[PDB]
Protein backbone atom coordinates (compact mmCIF):
# COMPACT_ATOMS: atom_id res chain seq x y z
CA UNK A 1 0.00 0.00 0.00
CA UNK A 2 1.01 3.60 0.69
CA UNK A 3 4.37 4.36 2.28
CA UNK A 4 4.35 6.54 5.42
CA UNK A 5 6.07 7.21 8.75
CA UNK A 6 5.10 3.80 10.14
CA UNK A 7 6.99 1.80 7.49
CA UNK A 8 9.87 4.27 7.06
CA UNK A 9 12.78 1.86 7.57
CA UNK A 10 11.41 -0.04 4.55
CA UNK A 11 13.11 2.59 2.39
CA UNK A 12 16.55 1.37 3.51
CA UNK A 13 16.08 -2.41 3.34
CA UNK A 14 17.64 -4.57 0.61
CA UNK A 15 14.63 -4.61 -1.74
CA UNK A 16 15.48 -2.32 -4.66
CA UNK A 17 13.08 0.60 -4.81
CA UNK A 18 12.85 3.95 -6.57
CA UNK A 19 11.06 7.18 -5.76
CA UNK A 20 9.66 9.01 -8.81
CA UNK A 21 8.87 12.72 -8.57
CA UNK A 22 7.28 14.38 -11.60
CA UNK A 23 6.97 17.91 -10.19
CA UNK A 24 9.66 19.40 -12.46
CA UNK A 25 8.74 17.55 -15.66
CA UNK A 26 6.52 20.27 -17.20
CA UNK A 27 7.82 23.73 -16.31
CA UNK A 28 6.61 27.06 -17.69
CA UNK A 29 6.98 30.80 -17.42
CA UNK A 30 3.70 32.76 -17.69
CA UNK A 31 3.69 36.10 -19.50
CA UNK A 32 1.55 38.71 -21.21
CA UNK A 33 1.27 38.83 -24.99
CA UNK A 34 1.27 41.96 -27.12
CA UNK A 35 -2.52 41.87 -27.27
CA UNK A 36 -2.71 41.64 -23.48
CA UNK A 37 -3.52 37.93 -23.27
CA UNK A 38 -1.52 35.42 -21.22
CA UNK A 39 0.69 32.73 -22.72
CA UNK A 40 3.04 30.10 -21.37
CA UNK A 41 6.58 29.29 -22.51
CA UNK A 42 7.88 25.85 -21.58
CA UNK A 43 11.41 25.44 -20.22
CA UNK A 44 13.41 22.24 -19.87
CA UNK A 45 12.38 19.96 -17.04
CA UNK A 46 13.40 16.68 -15.51
CA UNK A 47 12.19 13.45 -13.94
CA UNK A 48 13.68 12.86 -10.50
CA UNK A 49 14.07 9.07 -10.01
CA UNK A 50 15.98 8.17 -6.85
CA UNK A 51 17.10 4.99 -5.12
CA UNK A 52 16.93 6.09 -1.44
CA UNK A 53 19.26 3.30 -0.29
CA UNK A 54 22.18 3.94 -2.62
CA UNK A 55 21.69 7.58 -3.59
CA UNK A 56 21.63 6.78 -7.31
CA UNK A 57 19.67 9.49 -9.12
CA UNK A 58 18.49 8.87 -12.68
CA UNK A 59 17.82 12.42 -13.85
CA UNK A 60 15.97 12.25 -17.18
CA UNK A 61 16.09 15.70 -18.76
CA UNK A 62 12.80 16.61 -20.47
CA UNK A 63 13.62 18.92 -23.35
CA UNK A 64 10.97 21.44 -24.40
CA UNK A 65 10.74 19.82 -27.86
CA UNK A 66 8.74 16.94 -26.38
CA UNK A 67 5.80 19.33 -25.84
CA UNK A 68 5.76 20.70 -29.38
CA UNK A 69 2.33 20.44 -30.95
CA UNK A 70 0.91 18.51 -28.01
CA UNK A 71 -2.27 19.31 -26.10
CA UNK A 72 -3.18 19.02 -22.42
CA UNK A 73 0.45 19.20 -21.39
CA UNK A 74 -0.12 18.75 -17.64
CA UNK A 75 -1.84 15.41 -18.35
CA UNK A 76 0.70 14.40 -20.99
CA UNK A 77 3.56 15.12 -18.57
CA UNK A 78 2.36 12.36 -16.26
CA UNK A 79 2.23 9.84 -19.12
CA UNK A 80 5.62 10.94 -20.43
CA UNK A 81 7.03 10.48 -16.94
CA UNK A 82 5.58 7.00 -16.77
CA UNK A 83 6.88 6.16 -20.27
CA UNK A 84 10.40 7.24 -19.29
CA UNK A 85 10.40 5.36 -15.96
CA UNK A 86 9.17 2.23 -17.76
CA UNK A 87 11.97 2.66 -20.34
CA UNK A 88 14.53 3.04 -17.55
CA UNK A 89 13.36 -0.14 -15.84
CA UNK A 90 13.53 -2.07 -19.14
CA UNK A 91 17.06 -0.76 -19.70
CA UNK A 92 18.32 -2.13 -16.38
CA UNK A 93 19.54 -5.72 -15.95
CA UNK A 94 16.95 -7.90 -14.27
CA UNK A 95 18.85 -7.99 -10.97
CA UNK A 96 18.87 -4.16 -10.85
CA UNK A 97 15.20 -3.66 -11.60
CA UNK A 98 13.16 -2.27 -8.69
CA UNK A 99 10.70 -4.34 -6.75
CA UNK A 100 8.69 -1.20 -5.86
CA UNK A 101 8.31 2.27 -7.37
CA UNK A 102 6.98 4.95 -4.98
CA UNK A 103 5.40 7.98 -6.67
CA UNK A 104 5.39 11.26 -4.77
CA UNK A 105 2.07 12.38 -6.31
CA UNK A 106 -0.99 10.12 -6.52
CA UNK A 107 -1.81 11.35 -10.04
CA UNK A 108 1.21 9.29 -11.23
CA UNK A 109 -0.32 5.99 -10.09
CA UNK A 110 -2.51 5.10 -13.08
CA UNK A 111 -0.01 6.32 -15.74
CA UNK A 112 2.78 4.30 -14.14
CA UNK A 113 0.67 1.18 -13.53
CA UNK A 114 -0.47 1.19 -17.15
CA UNK A 115 3.08 1.61 -18.47
CA UNK A 116 4.31 -1.16 -16.14
CA UNK A 117 1.72 -3.82 -17.02
CA UNK A 118 4.56 -5.97 -18.43
CA UNK A 119 6.03 -6.02 -14.87
CA UNK A 120 3.16 -7.33 -12.71
CA UNK A 121 5.55 -8.03 -9.82
CA UNK A 122 6.75 -4.43 -9.48
CA UNK A 123 4.55 -2.70 -6.92
CA UNK A 124 3.48 0.86 -7.72
CA UNK A 125 2.81 2.72 -4.47
CA UNK A 126 1.92 6.25 -3.30
CA UNK A 127 3.33 7.82 -0.16
CA UNK A 128 1.99 9.91 2.69
CA UNK A 129 5.42 11.55 3.10
CA UNK A 130 5.59 15.17 1.91
CA UNK A 131 8.96 14.97 0.23
CA UNK A 132 10.73 18.09 -0.98
CA UNK A 133 12.06 16.65 -4.24
CA UNK A 134 10.64 19.61 -6.17
CA UNK A 135 13.64 21.54 -4.83
CA UNK A 136 16.06 19.35 -6.84
CA UNK A 137 16.36 22.26 -9.30
CA UNK A 138 17.78 24.34 -6.44
CA UNK A 139 20.89 22.12 -6.57
CA UNK A 140 23.11 24.16 -8.85
CA UNK A 141 24.70 21.30 -10.79
CA UNK A 142 21.33 19.66 -11.50
CA UNK A 143 19.72 22.93 -12.63
CA UNK A 144 22.70 23.59 -14.91
CA UNK A 145 22.56 20.29 -16.78
CA UNK A 146 18.79 20.64 -17.23
CA UNK A 147 18.92 24.18 -18.57
CA UNK A 148 21.89 23.55 -20.90
CA UNK A 149 20.33 20.48 -22.55
CA UNK A 150 19.56 20.83 -26.26
CA UNK A 151 18.00 17.34 -26.62
CA UNK A 152 16.61 14.60 -24.35
CA UNK A 153 19.34 13.22 -22.10
CA UNK A 154 19.72 11.00 -19.06
CA UNK A 155 22.33 11.97 -16.48
CA UNK A 156 23.28 9.80 -13.51
CA UNK A 157 24.29 11.24 -10.16
CA UNK A 158 24.79 10.09 -6.58
CA UNK A 159 22.72 12.59 -4.61
CA UNK A 160 24.52 11.58 -1.39
CA UNK A 161 28.04 12.36 -2.69
CA UNK A 162 30.32 10.12 -0.53
CA UNK A 163 28.22 10.36 2.63
CA UNK A 164 27.52 6.61 2.72
CA UNK A 165 31.21 6.05 3.53
CA UNK A 166 30.48 7.58 6.95
CA UNK A 167 26.69 7.41 7.57
CA UNK A 168 23.82 5.02 7.00
CA UNK A 169 21.29 5.45 4.22
CA UNK A 170 18.61 6.37 6.77
CA UNK A 171 20.77 9.26 7.98
CA UNK A 172 21.73 10.20 4.41
CA UNK A 173 18.10 10.40 3.32
CA UNK A 174 17.26 12.44 6.40
CA UNK A 175 20.07 14.87 5.59
CA UNK A 176 18.95 15.11 1.97
CA UNK A 177 15.34 15.79 2.86
CA UNK A 178 16.35 18.45 5.41
CA UNK A 179 18.55 20.20 2.83
CA UNK A 180 15.87 20.05 0.14
CA UNK A 181 13.14 21.24 2.50
CA UNK A 182 15.30 24.20 3.48
CA UNK A 183 16.04 24.98 -0.17
CA UNK A 184 12.30 24.86 -0.92
CA UNK A 185 11.43 27.08 2.05
CA UNK A 186 14.06 29.81 1.57
CA UNK A 187 16.44 29.02 -1.26
CA UNK A 188 18.62 32.11 -0.90
CA UNK A 189 19.18 31.59 2.82
CA UNK A 190 19.81 27.87 2.43
CA UNK A 191 22.43 28.40 -0.28
CA UNK A 192 24.05 31.05 1.92
CA UNK A 193 24.36 28.51 4.75
CA UNK A 194 25.82 25.90 2.42
CA UNK A 195 28.33 28.24 0.75
CA UNK A 196 29.11 30.84 3.49
CA UNK A 197 32.53 29.27 4.15
CA UNK A 198 34.76 29.57 1.06
CA UNK A 199 37.30 27.15 2.56
CA UNK A 200 34.78 24.30 2.25
CA UNK A 201 34.21 23.56 -1.42
CA UNK A 202 32.18 21.25 -3.63
CA UNK A 203 34.36 18.66 -5.33
CA UNK A 204 34.10 18.50 -9.12
CA UNK A 205 32.45 15.06 -8.82
CA UNK A 206 30.01 16.09 -6.00
CA UNK A 207 26.81 18.11 -5.59
CA UNK A 208 27.22 19.35 -1.98
CA UNK A 209 30.20 20.79 -0.04
CA UNK A 210 32.85 18.62 1.59
CA UNK A 211 31.76 19.13 5.18
CA UNK A 212 33.32 17.17 8.00
CA UNK A 213 31.07 15.24 10.36
CA UNK A 214 31.12 18.09 12.89
CA UNK A 215 30.44 20.67 10.19
CA UNK A 216 27.45 18.66 8.93
CA UNK A 217 25.98 18.83 12.46
CA UNK A 218 26.32 22.63 12.40
CA UNK A 219 24.86 22.89 8.88
CA UNK A 220 21.90 20.67 9.80
CA UNK A 221 21.22 22.85 12.86
CA UNK A 222 21.29 25.98 10.70
CA UNK A 223 18.91 24.40 8.21
CA UNK A 224 16.50 23.53 11.02
CA UNK A 225 16.80 27.11 12.30
CA UNK A 226 16.01 28.40 8.81
CA UNK A 227 12.90 26.25 8.53
CA UNK A 228 11.66 27.30 11.95
CA UNK A 229 12.44 30.98 11.25
CA UNK A 230 10.41 30.83 8.03
CA UNK A 231 7.55 29.09 9.84
CA UNK A 232 7.44 31.94 12.36
CA UNK A 233 7.50 34.56 9.61
CA UNK A 234 4.70 32.81 7.66
CA UNK A 235 2.27 32.33 10.54
CA UNK A 236 3.30 35.37 12.61
CA UNK A 237 4.54 33.17 15.46
Amino acid sequence: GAMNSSNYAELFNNDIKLFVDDTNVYRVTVHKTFEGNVATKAINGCIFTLNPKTGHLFLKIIHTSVWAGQKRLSQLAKWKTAEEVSALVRSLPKEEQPKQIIVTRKAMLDPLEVHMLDFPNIAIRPTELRLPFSAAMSIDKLSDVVMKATEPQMVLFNIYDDWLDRISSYTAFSRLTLLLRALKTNEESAKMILLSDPTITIKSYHLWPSFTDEQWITIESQMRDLILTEYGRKYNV
Binding site: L76, W79, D110, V114
Partner: protein, 300 residues
Protein backbone atom coordinates in the same frame (compact mmCIF):
# COMPACT_ATOMS: atom_id res chain seq x y z
CA UNK B 1 -48.40 -19.49 -25.03
CA UNK B 2 -46.46 -21.98 -22.86
CA UNK B 3 -46.67 -23.31 -19.33
CA UNK B 4 -44.27 -24.25 -16.44
CA UNK B 5 -46.28 -26.64 -14.20
CA UNK B 6 -45.26 -27.27 -10.57
CA UNK B 7 -45.50 -30.71 -8.95
CA UNK B 8 -46.46 -28.93 -5.65
CA UNK B 9 -45.44 -26.00 -3.39
CA UNK B 10 -44.49 -27.61 -0.07
CA UNK B 11 -42.69 -24.54 1.35
CA UNK B 12 -43.85 -20.95 1.50
CA UNK B 13 -41.99 -18.95 -1.15
CA UNK B 14 -42.04 -15.74 -3.16
CA UNK B 15 -41.99 -16.75 -6.84
CA UNK B 16 -40.77 -14.40 -9.54
CA UNK B 17 -41.48 -14.80 -13.23
CA UNK B 18 -39.59 -12.17 -15.21
CA UNK B 19 -40.34 -8.74 -13.68
CA UNK B 20 -43.41 -10.06 -11.76
CA UNK B 21 -43.70 -11.74 -8.39
CA UNK B 22 -46.28 -13.35 -6.12
CA UNK B 23 -46.38 -15.22 -2.82
CA UNK B 24 -47.28 -18.87 -2.38
CA UNK B 25 -48.22 -20.24 1.04
CA UNK B 26 -46.88 -23.46 2.57
CA UNK B 27 -48.76 -26.36 0.93
CA UNK B 28 -51.01 -24.03 -1.06
CA UNK B 29 -52.69 -25.74 -4.08
CA UNK B 30 -50.38 -24.09 -6.58
CA UNK B 31 -49.43 -25.88 -9.79
CA UNK B 32 -47.55 -23.39 -11.89
CA UNK B 33 -47.56 -20.54 -14.37
CA UNK B 34 -49.47 -20.46 -17.67
CA UNK B 35 -49.75 -18.06 -20.63
CA UNK B 36 -45.97 -17.47 -20.78
CA UNK B 37 -45.20 -15.43 -23.93
CA UNK B 38 -43.43 -17.38 -26.62
CA UNK B 39 -40.46 -15.70 -28.27
CA UNK B 40 -38.46 -14.54 -25.27
CA UNK B 41 -36.19 -16.04 -22.71
CA UNK B 42 -37.73 -16.08 -19.25
CA UNK B 43 -36.55 -16.42 -15.66
CA UNK B 44 -38.44 -18.13 -12.85
CA UNK B 45 -37.00 -17.23 -9.48
CA UNK B 46 -37.48 -18.01 -5.81
CA UNK B 47 -36.95 -16.55 -2.37
CA UNK B 48 -37.98 -18.76 0.54
CA UNK B 49 -40.24 -17.19 3.14
CA UNK B 50 -38.38 -18.80 6.05
CA UNK B 51 -34.90 -18.01 4.70
CA UNK B 52 -34.45 -15.03 2.40
CA UNK B 53 -30.85 -16.26 1.94
CA UNK B 54 -30.23 -17.64 -1.49
CA UNK B 55 -32.48 -16.09 -4.00
CA UNK B 56 -32.14 -18.58 -6.88
CA UNK B 57 -33.79 -19.33 -10.22
CA UNK B 58 -33.74 -20.64 -13.73
CA UNK B 59 -33.41 -19.08 -17.16
CA UNK B 60 -35.36 -21.00 -19.81
CA UNK B 61 -37.04 -20.75 -23.22
CA UNK B 62 -40.19 -22.87 -23.66
CA UNK B 63 -39.35 -23.35 -27.32
CA UNK B 64 -36.44 -25.58 -26.24
CA UNK B 65 -38.42 -28.14 -24.25
CA UNK B 66 -41.13 -28.82 -21.73
CA UNK B 67 -40.01 -27.64 -18.23
CA UNK B 68 -41.62 -28.05 -14.76
CA UNK B 69 -40.65 -27.26 -11.14
CA UNK B 70 -40.64 -29.93 -8.36
CA UNK B 71 -39.49 -29.23 -4.78
CA UNK B 72 -36.54 -31.41 -3.64
CA UNK B 73 -36.79 -31.98 0.15
CA UNK B 74 -33.17 -33.22 0.30
CA UNK B 75 -31.47 -30.27 -1.37
CA UNK B 76 -34.20 -27.93 -0.07
CA UNK B 77 -35.06 -26.10 -3.23
CA UNK B 78 -37.43 -25.81 -6.14
CA UNK B 79 -35.70 -27.49 -9.09
CA UNK B 80 -36.39 -27.11 -12.77
CA UNK B 81 -36.64 -30.32 -14.72
CA UNK B 82 -37.34 -31.29 -18.34
CA UNK B 83 -40.16 -33.73 -19.22
CA UNK B 84 -39.22 -35.69 -22.41
CA UNK B 85 -42.68 -37.41 -22.64
CA UNK B 86 -44.64 -34.70 -24.43
CA UNK B 87 -47.98 -36.55 -24.35
CA UNK B 88 -47.59 -36.93 -20.54
CA UNK B 89 -46.64 -33.22 -20.20
CA UNK B 90 -49.64 -31.95 -22.27
CA UNK B 91 -51.96 -34.14 -20.09
CA UNK B 92 -50.50 -32.77 -16.78
CA UNK B 93 -50.73 -29.15 -18.06
CA UNK B 94 -54.35 -29.63 -19.27
CA UNK B 95 -55.46 -31.05 -15.85
CA UNK B 96 -53.75 -28.20 -13.88
CA UNK B 97 -55.36 -25.66 -16.32
CA UNK B 98 -58.90 -27.19 -16.01
CA UNK B 99 -58.70 -27.20 -12.20
CA UNK B 100 -57.52 -23.54 -12.35
CA UNK B 101 -54.47 -24.28 -10.23
CA UNK B 102 -52.15 -21.97 -12.21
CA UNK B 103 -51.41 -18.26 -12.21
CA UNK B 104 -51.41 -16.49 -15.54
CA UNK B 105 -48.37 -14.55 -16.69
CA UNK B 106 -49.81 -11.04 -16.13
CA UNK B 107 -48.68 -9.27 -19.29
CA UNK B 108 -50.48 -6.04 -20.19
CA UNK B 109 -50.94 -5.70 -23.95
CA UNK B 110 -49.48 -2.15 -24.03
CA UNK B 111 -46.40 -3.32 -22.12
CA UNK B 112 -43.13 -4.09 -23.92
CA UNK B 113 -40.99 -4.04 -20.74
CA UNK B 114 -39.82 -7.65 -20.92
CA UNK B 115 -38.96 -7.45 -24.62
CA UNK B 116 -37.09 -4.20 -23.93
CA UNK B 117 -35.06 -5.82 -21.14
CA UNK B 118 -34.23 -9.02 -23.08
CA UNK B 119 -34.08 -7.81 -26.71
CA UNK B 120 -30.56 -9.17 -27.22
CA UNK B 121 -30.60 -12.05 -24.68
CA UNK B 122 -30.53 -15.52 -26.20
CA UNK B 123 -30.72 -18.83 -24.37
CA UNK B 124 -27.75 -20.26 -26.29
CA UNK B 125 -25.51 -17.46 -25.00
CA UNK B 126 -26.87 -17.80 -21.48
CA UNK B 127 -25.77 -21.46 -21.55
CA UNK B 128 -22.20 -20.37 -22.36
CA UNK B 129 -22.05 -17.98 -19.39
CA UNK B 130 -23.71 -20.56 -17.10
CA UNK B 131 -22.10 -23.94 -17.87
CA UNK B 132 -24.22 -27.05 -17.23
CA UNK B 133 -24.51 -28.73 -20.60
CA UNK B 134 -26.85 -31.57 -19.59
CA UNK B 135 -29.79 -29.16 -19.10
CA UNK B 136 -31.49 -26.78 -21.55
CA UNK B 137 -32.17 -24.26 -18.74
CA UNK B 138 -29.66 -22.40 -16.54
CA UNK B 139 -29.50 -22.05 -12.75
CA UNK B 140 -28.31 -18.76 -11.24
CA UNK B 141 -28.28 -17.66 -7.60
CA UNK B 142 -27.37 -14.69 -5.43
CA UNK B 143 -23.99 -16.06 -4.35
CA UNK B 144 -22.49 -17.35 -7.61
CA UNK B 145 -19.19 -15.65 -8.35
CA UNK B 146 -17.86 -14.63 -11.74
CA UNK B 147 -14.69 -15.84 -13.41
CA UNK B 148 -13.17 -12.39 -12.87
CA UNK B 149 -14.06 -12.36 -9.17
CA UNK B 150 -12.43 -15.79 -8.84
CA UNK B 151 -9.15 -14.62 -10.42
CA UNK B 152 -8.84 -11.91 -7.74
CA UNK B 153 -13.83 -20.71 -5.93
CA UNK B 154 -15.59 -23.70 -7.54
CA UNK B 155 -15.26 -23.16 -11.33
CA UNK B 156 -18.23 -25.38 -12.26
CA UNK B 157 -20.62 -23.03 -10.40
CA UNK B 158 -19.33 -19.73 -11.81
CA UNK B 159 -20.65 -17.01 -14.07
CA UNK B 160 -18.38 -16.96 -17.14
CA UNK B 161 -18.95 -13.35 -18.17
CA UNK B 162 -16.39 -11.86 -20.54
CA UNK B 163 -13.53 -10.44 -18.49
CA UNK B 164 -13.21 -6.66 -18.78
CA UNK B 165 -10.24 -5.06 -17.01
CA UNK B 166 -9.23 -1.51 -17.95
CA UNK B 167 -5.67 -1.95 -16.56
CA UNK B 168 -4.77 -5.14 -18.38
CA UNK B 169 -2.57 -5.92 -21.37
CA UNK B 170 -5.72 -6.97 -23.22
CA UNK B 171 -7.05 -3.42 -22.83
CA UNK B 172 -3.81 -1.53 -23.57
CA UNK B 173 -1.66 -1.86 -26.68
CA UNK B 174 2.06 -1.57 -25.93
CA UNK B 175 3.06 1.84 -27.22
CA UNK B 176 -0.47 3.24 -26.99
CA UNK B 177 -0.70 3.41 -23.20
CA UNK B 178 -2.10 6.92 -22.72
CA UNK B 179 -4.21 6.69 -25.85
CA UNK B 180 -5.86 3.38 -24.98
CA UNK B 181 -6.34 4.20 -21.27
CA UNK B 182 -7.99 7.58 -21.84
CA UNK B 183 -9.96 6.45 -24.94
CA UNK B 184 -11.08 2.83 -24.77
CA UNK B 185 -12.24 2.62 -28.44
CA UNK B 186 -9.56 0.05 -29.36
CA UNK B 187 -10.57 -2.20 -26.49
CA UNK B 188 -14.27 -1.78 -27.27
CA UNK B 189 -14.21 -2.06 -31.06
CA UNK B 190 -11.26 -4.30 -31.92
CA UNK B 191 -10.77 -6.47 -28.85
CA UNK B 192 -14.35 -6.81 -27.63
CA UNK B 193 -16.71 -6.25 -30.55
CA UNK B 194 -14.68 -7.57 -33.49
CA UNK B 195 -12.64 -10.08 -31.48
CA UNK B 196 -14.69 -11.67 -28.70
CA UNK B 197 -18.37 -10.77 -29.16
CA UNK B 198 -18.35 -10.59 -33.00
CA UNK B 199 -21.21 -8.04 -32.98
CA UNK B 200 -22.95 -5.45 -30.80
CA UNK B 201 -26.02 -7.67 -30.38
CA UNK B 202 -24.01 -10.25 -28.45
CA UNK B 203 -22.36 -7.51 -26.37
CA UNK B 204 -25.72 -6.01 -25.46
CA UNK B 205 -27.15 -9.45 -24.72
CA UNK B 206 -24.47 -10.09 -22.10
CA UNK B 207 -24.95 -6.60 -20.66
CA UNK B 208 -28.69 -7.19 -20.38
CA UNK B 209 -28.24 -10.64 -18.82
CA UNK B 210 -25.84 -9.20 -16.26
CA UNK B 211 -28.30 -6.49 -15.28
CA UNK B 212 -31.14 -8.98 -14.89
CA UNK B 213 -29.06 -11.30 -12.69
CA UNK B 214 -28.04 -8.33 -10.56
CA UNK B 215 -31.64 -7.21 -10.17
CA UNK B 216 -33.42 -10.55 -9.73
CA UNK B 217 -30.84 -12.31 -7.55
CA UNK B 218 -28.82 -9.47 -6.00
CA UNK B 219 -25.80 -11.09 -7.65
CA UNK B 220 -22.94 -8.69 -6.97
CA UNK B 221 -20.56 -9.93 -9.68
CA UNK B 222 -23.31 -9.46 -12.23
CA UNK B 223 -23.75 -5.85 -11.12
CA UNK B 224 -20.01 -5.33 -11.56
CA UNK B 225 -20.17 -6.77 -15.09
CA UNK B 226 -23.16 -4.62 -16.07
CA UNK B 227 -21.40 -1.43 -14.97
CA UNK B 228 -18.12 -2.46 -16.65
CA UNK B 229 -19.87 -2.98 -19.98
CA UNK B 230 -21.56 0.42 -19.72
CA UNK B 231 -18.35 2.20 -18.72
CA UNK B 232 -16.42 0.60 -21.60
CA UNK B 233 -18.85 2.11 -24.13
CA UNK B 234 -19.11 5.50 -22.42
CA UNK B 235 -15.30 5.74 -22.12
CA UNK B 236 -14.80 5.18 -25.88
CA UNK B 237 -14.66 8.23 -28.10
CA UNK B 238 -15.52 6.22 -31.24
CA UNK B 239 -18.76 4.22 -30.97
CA UNK B 240 -21.16 3.54 -33.86
CA UNK B 241 -24.15 5.86 -33.70
CA UNK B 242 -26.57 2.92 -33.76
CA UNK B 243 -24.89 1.38 -30.72
CA UNK B 244 -25.16 4.59 -28.71
CA UNK B 245 -28.82 5.03 -29.57
CA UNK B 246 -29.55 1.41 -28.70
CA UNK B 247 -27.59 1.67 -25.42
CA UNK B 248 -29.68 4.67 -24.41
CA UNK B 249 -32.82 2.58 -24.96
CA UNK B 250 -31.43 -0.43 -23.09
CA UNK B 251 -30.38 1.62 -20.09
CA UNK B 252 -33.60 3.64 -19.96
CA UNK B 253 -35.70 0.49 -19.57
CA UNK B 254 -33.31 -0.95 -17.01
CA UNK B 255 -33.40 2.20 -14.88
CA UNK B 256 -37.20 2.34 -15.30
CA UNK B 257 -37.64 -1.23 -14.02
CA UNK B 258 -35.21 -1.05 -11.09
CA UNK B 259 -37.05 -0.96 -7.75
CA UNK B 260 -36.65 2.55 -6.37
CA UNK B 261 -35.66 1.10 -2.99
CA UNK B 262 -32.74 -0.97 -4.38
CA UNK B 263 -31.04 1.99 -6.06
CA UNK B 264 -28.50 2.27 -3.24
CA UNK B 265 -27.24 -1.29 -3.79
CA UNK B 266 -27.69 -1.71 -7.56
CA UNK B 267 -26.24 1.59 -8.90
CA UNK B 268 -22.57 2.59 -8.75
CA UNK B 269 -22.37 6.34 -8.16
CA UNK B 270 -18.91 6.71 -9.69
CA UNK B 271 -19.76 4.88 -12.91
CA UNK B 272 -23.04 6.69 -13.47
CA UNK B 273 -21.69 10.16 -12.73
CA UNK B 274 -18.66 9.51 -14.93
CA UNK B 275 -20.80 8.13 -17.76
CA UNK B 276 -23.50 10.81 -17.74
CA UNK B 277 -21.42 13.91 -16.95
CA UNK B 278 -17.70 13.33 -17.71
CA UNK B 279 -17.39 10.65 -20.42
CA UNK B 280 -17.07 10.94 -24.20
CA UNK B 281 -20.72 9.88 -24.38
CA UNK B 282 -21.95 12.26 -21.67
CA UNK B 283 -24.32 13.84 -24.24
CA UNK B 284 -25.30 10.68 -26.15
CA UNK B 285 -27.65 9.10 -23.56
CA UNK B 286 -30.47 11.62 -23.48
CA UNK B 287 -33.27 9.27 -22.41
CA UNK B 288 -31.20 7.57 -19.69
CA UNK B 289 -29.92 10.88 -18.33
CA UNK B 290 -33.48 12.22 -18.11
CA UNK B 291 -34.87 9.22 -16.23
CA UNK B 292 -31.85 9.05 -13.94
CA UNK B 293 -32.07 12.76 -13.06
CA UNK B 294 -35.80 12.49 -12.32
CA UNK B 295 -35.86 9.13 -10.53
CA UNK B 296 -32.50 9.04 -8.70
CA UNK B 297 -31.23 12.63 -8.39
CA UNK B 298 -29.63 11.73 -5.05
CA UNK B 299 -27.18 9.31 -6.68
CA UNK B 300 -25.96 12.19 -8.83
Amino acid sequence: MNTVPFTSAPIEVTIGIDQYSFNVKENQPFHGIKDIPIGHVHVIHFQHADNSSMRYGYWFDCRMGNFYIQYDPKDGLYKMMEERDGAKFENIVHNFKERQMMVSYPKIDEDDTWYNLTEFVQMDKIRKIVRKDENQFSYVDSSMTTVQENELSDPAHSLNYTVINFKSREAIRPGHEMEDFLDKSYYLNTVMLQGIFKNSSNYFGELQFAFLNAMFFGNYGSSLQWHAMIELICSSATVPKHMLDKLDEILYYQIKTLPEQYSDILLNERVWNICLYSSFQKNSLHNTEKIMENKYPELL
